[PDB]
Amino acid sequence: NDYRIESDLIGELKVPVNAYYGVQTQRAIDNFKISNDHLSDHPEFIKAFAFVKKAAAQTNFELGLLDEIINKNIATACDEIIAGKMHKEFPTDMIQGGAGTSMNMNANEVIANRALELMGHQKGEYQFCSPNDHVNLSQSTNDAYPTAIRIALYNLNKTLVERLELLIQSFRKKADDLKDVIKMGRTQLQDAVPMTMGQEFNAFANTLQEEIARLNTNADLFLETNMGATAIGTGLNAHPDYAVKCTENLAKISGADVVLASDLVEATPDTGAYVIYSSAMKRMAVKLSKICNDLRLLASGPRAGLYEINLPKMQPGSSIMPGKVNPVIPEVVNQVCFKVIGNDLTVTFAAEAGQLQLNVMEPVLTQSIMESIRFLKNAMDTLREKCIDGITANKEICLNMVKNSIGIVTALNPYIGYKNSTKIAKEALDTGKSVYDLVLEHELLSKEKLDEILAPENMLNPHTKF
Amino acid sequence: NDYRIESDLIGELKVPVNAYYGVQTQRAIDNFKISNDHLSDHPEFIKAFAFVKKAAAQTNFELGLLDEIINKNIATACDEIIAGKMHKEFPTDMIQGGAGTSMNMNANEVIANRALELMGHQKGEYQFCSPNDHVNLSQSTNDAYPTAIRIALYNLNKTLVERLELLIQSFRKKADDLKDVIKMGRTQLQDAVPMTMGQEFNAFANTLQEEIARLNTNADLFLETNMGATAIGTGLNAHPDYAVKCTENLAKISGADVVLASDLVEATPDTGAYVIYSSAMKRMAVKLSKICNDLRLLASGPRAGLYEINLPKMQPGSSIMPGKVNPVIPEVVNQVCFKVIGNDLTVTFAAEAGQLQLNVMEPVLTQSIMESIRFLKNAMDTLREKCIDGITANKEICLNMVKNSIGIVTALNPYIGYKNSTKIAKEALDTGKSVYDLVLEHELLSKEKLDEILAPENMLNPHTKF
Amino acid sequence: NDYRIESDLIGELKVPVNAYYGVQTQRAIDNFKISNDHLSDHPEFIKAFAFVKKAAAQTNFELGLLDEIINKNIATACDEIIAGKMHKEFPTDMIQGGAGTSMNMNANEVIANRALELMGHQKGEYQFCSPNDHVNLSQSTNDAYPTAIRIALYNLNKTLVERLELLIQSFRKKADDLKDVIKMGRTQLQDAVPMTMGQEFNAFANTLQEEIARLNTNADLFLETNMGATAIGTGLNAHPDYAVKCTENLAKISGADVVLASDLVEATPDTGAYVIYSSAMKRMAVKLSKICNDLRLLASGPRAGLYEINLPKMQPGSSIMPGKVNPVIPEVVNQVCFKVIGNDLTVTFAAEAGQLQLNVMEPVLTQSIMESIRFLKNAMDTLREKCIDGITANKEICLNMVKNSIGIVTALNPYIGYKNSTKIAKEALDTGKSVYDLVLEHELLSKEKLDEILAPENMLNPHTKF
Amino acid sequence: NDYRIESDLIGELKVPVNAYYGVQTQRAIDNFKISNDHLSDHPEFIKAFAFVKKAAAQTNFELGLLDEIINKNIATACDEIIAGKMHKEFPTDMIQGGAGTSMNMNANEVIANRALELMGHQKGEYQFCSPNDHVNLSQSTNDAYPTAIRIALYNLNKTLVERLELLIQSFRKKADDLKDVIKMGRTQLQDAVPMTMGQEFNAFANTLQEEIARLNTNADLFLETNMGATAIGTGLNAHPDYAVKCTENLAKISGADVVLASDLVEATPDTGAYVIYSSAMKRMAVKLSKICNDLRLLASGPRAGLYEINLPKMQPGSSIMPGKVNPVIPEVVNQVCFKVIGNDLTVTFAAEAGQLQLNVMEPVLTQSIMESIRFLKNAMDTLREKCIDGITANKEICLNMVKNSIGIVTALNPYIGYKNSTKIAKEALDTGKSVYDLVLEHELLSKEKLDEILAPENMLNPHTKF
Ligand SMILES: O=C(O)/C=C/C(=O)O
Ligand SMILES: O=C(O)/C=C/C(=O)O
Ligand SMILES: O=C(O)/C=C/C(=O)O
Ligand SMILES: O=C(O)/C=C/C(=O)O
Ligand SMILES: [Cl-]
Ligand SMILES: [Cl-]
Ligand SMILES: [Cl-]
Ligand SMILES: [Cl-]
Ligand SMILES: [Cl-]
Ligand SMILES: [Cl-]
Ligand SMILES: [Cl-]
Ligand SMILES: [Cl-]
Ligand SMILES: [Cl-]
Ligand SMILES: [Cl-]
Ligand SMILES: [Cl-]
Ligand SMILES: [Cl-]
Q1: Which helix (H) or strand (E) holds C418?
Q2: Is B375 in Cβ contact with A35 (below 8 Å)?
Q3: What distance in Å separates the CA atoms of residue C49 and residue C45, rounded to the nearest whole number?
Q4: CB D63: neighbour CB atoms within 10 A?
Q5: Where is the Fumarate lyase N-terminal domain (chains A, B, C, D) (predicted)?
Q6: Using a 6 Å cutoff on CB, does residue C461 contact ligand 2?
Q7: Are A234 and C460 within 8 A, CB to CB?
């Protein structure tokens, strides 16, 4: 009553009477109880499956292999799923065995049952629309599933880049706010030469801007797809025109410029695109983490630190230390970046585990990439909104570090040479006397020329000799 | 109406009127929206915080620092949390900035507000029970929080070892079922010498049994705790007798044999125990993955593989290939193992990121360890129940591999020497003739002696020559 | 006597009297005794330093900043180093502190002392040619050193791709050798559908061919260089026209199409190019390892394995098992691939450790990438010469696997539907009767049609329905 | 003339006429040209092989299986190798295929040929002492080789711990030098509460002291050995008393307390001990790296940093910035630590690649562990001798940070409560007035009590309330 009985290769099984999924999905629900992450939590992934199934059905219809009415109803069911309906009917664990077969069959069963309803039949009456013979016609998991992954990740990358662009813009705006803050550059954490905080924050923006092209060019690799490979890449049970026509139909339906891999036998076990895209995310996370490490260091203080900048105060720092406020927003970003790096290692193991004509470890690989994308979007939005936008500088503290530095002696090299500048630098360190006073003390340069050479505003760019 | 107004260092903030948490927890909820994993999902972690707060209050009372009535009501509130109540009042993200302060203050606020109710006051009337001055008395996040992590992970390790032991026993029972199945060992995937499946499956059990002592001895490192360190390990604001007395009280309350670190300045930034415990989980996951790789290989077939064993058939293998059934249960375990390995790298980055008197990256480190423990328990239960318990062998296929192998010639080395055995082996490979027939043709041993040495049952143990 | 005395900021120090390096190189020799890997072992790295110093000197002269005669002798010294002379004068550890300053100063000292000789002076008479004021004029380590790394790695990538392409061609030739070997595809290690070994080995070639563009496009990122950044990217002490002119001169001198980074402040701490290039090497190593895993599996045997292929026999397999021969060449490649993956993690830690205006961890990062390139070239040559070129197939063994398989039932789906094909497949497994015989016993298809559908030669490509 | 011809399963091959190795070693030299790291570079590894062969021969003699004269001469040859002779006769690459067979046969061939000379025969006259039938009697590579690895790593761990202990003592001595340097603790890089630099450097010593037990207890796992396993753990061809007797003889000969694994089938593919030992090295490297990061931060300066400590000046910091000196010794240690972490990932991949009755990836696993041991010993020696021993503090700079801090307000909590302390802290930050002056201004505590509570020397330990 509350169930219907379905059957497959394994035998008979009860399915909830109103479920749009069928017996093979039910088995996968039962078999893989690993995580709290399920396909229903990934709307772009479900949408991509619906794109794939709509394209395959349209191609089968155009090639004379699928009845016009069944195609019409598969397309309507796919349109509904694309529009956001029935996603609760996709309940399997993102960490699952079977190499994606359980997700492909989940799509086949849900679409078949909705198409049956549109034909005036009841769920489970697969004699009128078969998950295998109609919704999966001319397909395998081993092309439909990776093609769905690739379109989903291509689309998710668009959203990752969008949040990255907003973060970049936040750094550029803050660089303009801070453009007149002269401060001391540091290399190896030792005093170097002067710079502006505008230069430093524009450098944050510009190194992150480089990641746009890295993320986009590697996500473009996902557009090479293998529809028509069927089981292992030979195209067994596909029509000679199907691979090209299905790929063209899929490009039009999805709006992604998918193209057909030139060797489908090569493509079917190929996980390289996922590896290098995960690596591009790792590269960006390494840069983001470094930037956050810099921010926590420059905000150190208030009395025993560098104290060049102030981060927005978002919560009390300490249960015991009164008045303390900690850089909690860069800290949570660092932690996300470490998770991304670890997830990238998971991807590497999964990719290296492929065997012969298929890699069966793509579920955890996809789960890890999608988790990294989600966490990175959230970390970047948090960093932008609750930290970068409201940063201020301690301008006088920074300027006094420059005025009292020895490193400005570097600007004298073109005039007195490195040996003589070193003599001045050593004496400044040993005695505490200023570089400026020592140069005049030793009568190395006129005051008029020295005033130009040691002006901090004159050390921010290359210049001809004064 | 639906809110009350609380205040902290940052300012005033609305808090849901019936929440047991307070302003600092609310800020953390607002500040860290990263993941779908929250403290409320980790009962052992919440319970450990309640142990710590009950022990600290009891110690403060015994030292004359805390009123008897406030101690009594803190204790009652902690007892309720230990018993499983009010866990929904702990809603912050497991990936959070602030180095744990938001979890410590969440415990301080919830316990204070419950103690206030027991005193006949209203939530937020902190003048009668202060989150900082009473519930956090003599403490910092920087001892209460890592002590809670360590007790929680020590207790979660017990559950991990319990599920591992059930899996070990499943392998032992299956080894007994298969004890008479003689088969070919393989090294470097080349034919080696005979063995039994009893030997092979007991070896699975025995290598996993070795992980019990590794997990337990590394989890024992968590018992070294730092109560009394307060902010950085100096014990500022603690009574001289507090560190020893609080640790003793915590051992009695928690039932874990916690001991006091001999150098609290050393202990406060120390993440080494988490690193090596995570590594012990990684080692066990590597072993589990290798075993699952073996099972998928020995189950290969049915007509073009090794086909030594049959795994329970848990779902149809293929949307296109009829009759195919895949080793989906070992596959999902492999994937969990890869996730554990990646999470262990996240732990390594977090640990290496410590600075001076504190490591602020413990939230994601703990999140990753707890995720690995949960996934491993689920993977081991799944492997046991849906695969190991029901394995069968193809006994005649295995025996015929032994009888037809060349590698059994190895058993003749003590009688005819390696050069002569090599001559037999080369001729067997080149001609397709059997080792047995070739030895008799060359008349290197009597038929009666050869019948003994090359009997499959006599090639499984050391033996005396005759 | 056998020494000369030189001095620097630290003080006076003995240098071997005939060494071309000077005091700062001697200090680095003394300070960093870590590994057996020294700069003298990396000719492309030394050559790149000479390119950089020649280009900088040419530019300084073209800007009127360096005497034409001193430029001429610096150029001659650089030409000698480029031609392969004096590489023993570069003896520092590849794992060294100082962020590359010790390598930059080694180049400055060697070139100065050779220029001094060409001018009729003695080594160490730096008053006539200064390592700092002449050979390092307008430069810092922080542009000369990464520019040298990037040119060296760009050139080393050419050699890596060259050896990869030889290996690819070896797979293509072997694919043609084996084009008529029909065999069983396998997914999830279960029998799938037929393919040819030509298809499988061409897929090996084609997946590796995809790595050419990945390695090349990521190595092209090295061409963005930062000459003119000087200490931190501000261009302090450089002429305004120097950065563009030096980059153009460097492109002409090196033959590499280097271009000037648009933000030198961004570029100076930027390690992203190394991270993603190392990741591209990792991706290729993961593919190579998978292919080697496949070869070891397909070569398993001779009597208890798959035994589809024979690898050239390169040494006795066993000290105890007579006649055994193991897949030692794929095995050593696997091991190199694991080393590449580990070295890639070292690169990731080094990159994430950058601080403010410089990343000081580039020596071990460069050491690790260069070690991976060298090991991979050796592994690929070994795999090609001692394995791939001589592979043969066991043609009858493979053909009989196809003839006796159940998986050919897949070809019936378009004619009888998946339900009926499943019934046939299950009966074939349960009874051992052939798929062909069962189809006729069920009167599903005529013999004439069945003979065409189930011909394995008709399963290797898509085709219209018979 | 300059060659002799030897024979094996593959065929005949020339060997250098005076080489103690034989044909199978020559093949391995020819087959594996990967790295510049050869067995001859690892004396403890060669020594361990000689222990193993001497113990096996003595046991075979005691069991009546080996002639007394052959045993005597094998023992003498092993003694010479143990004493350091003939190590140049072990020339194979540490990265090699064949799973260790090439190293086992190298030992068999060298020992056989030296035994032949002691018997008055010529090299290669194996009819009087057979590498396979005598020197390898009752053995496989698959017990002799891992037993040699395990004894070698057990002995190398002793040297690693020795160098760690020297470094620990260097930190303890320096802590005593700095015991009176009061300074500001920092958490999350924000001002925390006071400590002494003696506390901080003793914490360095004490956290490293914890690594001694981790390294030793994990190296003790190597003492479980598998002599008597022969090919796969079944003991085929061994006498039933051999495994126990050989292990006892090996313990006496080697001086290492080896014990017999209780399940030799389990032990033969078991790589878990290597994984967790490498993880213990990784944990120590993570701690060492953190300490070095701390040192580089505390040494930042001289005018724009924290400048708490001075590191010995070991070389000029910069080719351009005069007077600059960088923390190059902690930097090189950081880089070694990153290399150790990457090598640990190589170990993990190698371990997870085991298949059925053997793991063939142990050569690169062992190569990576031995590289990490060597690099870590050199890094620790360098850190001790060229940095820690000569550190000094800037005592007045540190004391003024404490005196001018706001964080000392924490000490007021037991007297005025956290809310009142927060009011003082916020007013100090906003106005720049001192915590001390504000407390007296607001008349919160008497000057007599305040002079005690806020004395820096009274904040370094727990105390009873003043
Ligand atoms: O919440 C605390 O007690 C400590 C915080 C910190 O170290 O900043
Ligand atoms: O579900 C499929 O179409 C394929 C599965 C497999 O390769 O076993
Ligand atoms: O060399 C041996 O004794 C074993 C080798 C193998 O397992 O093939
Ligand atoms: O050697 C240089 O030019 C720079 C060194 C530094 O950044 O300290
Ligand atoms: Cl999604
Ligand atoms: Cl540094
Ligand atoms: Cl997302
Ligand atoms: Cl929990
Ligand atoms: Cl192998
Ligand atoms: Cl759990
Ligand atoms: Cl080179
Ligand atoms: Cl599989
Ligand atoms: Cl090279
Ligand atoms: Cl050694
Ligand atoms: Cl921080
Ligand atoms: Cl060593």
Answers
A1: helix C413-431
A2: yes
A3: 6
A4: 18
A5: 11-342
A6: no
A7: yes
- Residue A226 CA to its chain's centroid (Å): 24
The experimental resolution of this structure, in angstroms, equals: 1.5
Q: What is the CATH number of the domain that holds D38?
A: 1.10.275.10
Residue nearest to atom 7 of ligand 1 (CA): D187
Cβ atoms within 10 A of the Cβ of D177, count?
Answer: 15
CA-CA distance, A123 to A117, in Å (whole number)? 7
Nearest CA residue ID for atom 1, ligand 3 = C318
Nearest partner of A167 among A221, A215, A112, judged by Cα: A215
d(CA D181, CA D204): 16
For residue B87, with 0-12 CB atoms within 10 Å meaning exposed, 13-18 middle and 19 or more buried, which class applies?
A: middle
- Residue in C102, C332, C344 nearest the CB of D95: C332
Residues A398 and A424 grouped into a single domain: no
Distance B143 CA to ligand 1 centre (A): 9
Is there a single domain that holds both residue B421 and residue B398? Answer: no
Pairing of strands C3-7, B182-187: unpaired
User: Residue C247 burial (CB < 10 Å; 0-12/13-18/19+)?
Assistant: buried
Residues A97 and A159 placed together within one structural domain of the fold? no
Domain match, C436 and C371 both: no
D429, D434, D436, D439 alpha-carbon torsion, rounded to 10°:
-50
Domain boundary residue, one of C123, C139, C155: C139
- The CATH number of the domain where D445 resides is what? 1.10.40.30
The residue behind tokens 């290359």 is: A462
CA distance C186 to A265: 12
* Number of structural domains found in chain B: 3
Spatial separation of the C-alpha atoms in residues B193 and C269, rounded to whole Å = 58
DSSP state of D70: H
Is residue B318 among the annotated active site residues?
yes
Nearest chain A residue to D331 by CA distance is A188
Cis peptide before B330 (omega within 30 of 0): no
How far is residue B60's CA from residue B71's CA, in Å, rounded to a whole number? Answer: 8
| Residue to mutate, C92, C102, C104, C142, ligand 4, most ligand atoms under 8 Å from C-beta | C142
Q: Is B316 in the pocket of ligand 2 (CB under 6 A)?
A: no
Name, in order, each residue with C-beta under 8 angstroms of D329's C-beta and a sequence gap of 6 or more.
C31, C97, D311, D312, D314, D382, D383, D386, D387
Measured CA to CA in angstroms, residue A379 lies from A340, C430, D38, D450 at distances of 11, 56, 47, 44
Rounded Cα distance, B163 and B159, in Å: 6
Instruction: Look at residues C139, C165, C200 and tell me which one is the last residue of a structural domain.
Output: C139
Ligand nearest to the CA of residue C162, numbered in listed order: 13
A174 contact partners, CB below 8 Å, separation of at least 6: A201, A388, A389, A391
> Do A39 and A77 fall within a single domain?
yes
Q: Which chains touch A (3 or more CB pairs under 8 A)?
A: B, C, D
Domain coverage including residue A20 = 4-139
Chain B residues within an 8 Å CB radius of A380: none
* CB neighbourhood size of D340 (10 A): 27
| CATH assignment at residue A377 | 1.20.200.10
C359 lines ligand 4 (CB under 6 A): no
Neighbours of B118 (CB within 10 A): 17
Which residues line ion ligand 15, judged by CB < 5 Å? A 296; B 360; D 188
Q: Do A325 and A459 belong to one domain?
A: no
User: HSE (CB half, 13 Å, CA atoms) of A352?
Assistant: 25
Separation between Cα atoms, residue C410 and residue A301, nearest integer Å: 70
Same domain, yes or no, for B295 and B416?
A: no
**Do B168 and B205 belong to one domain?**
yes
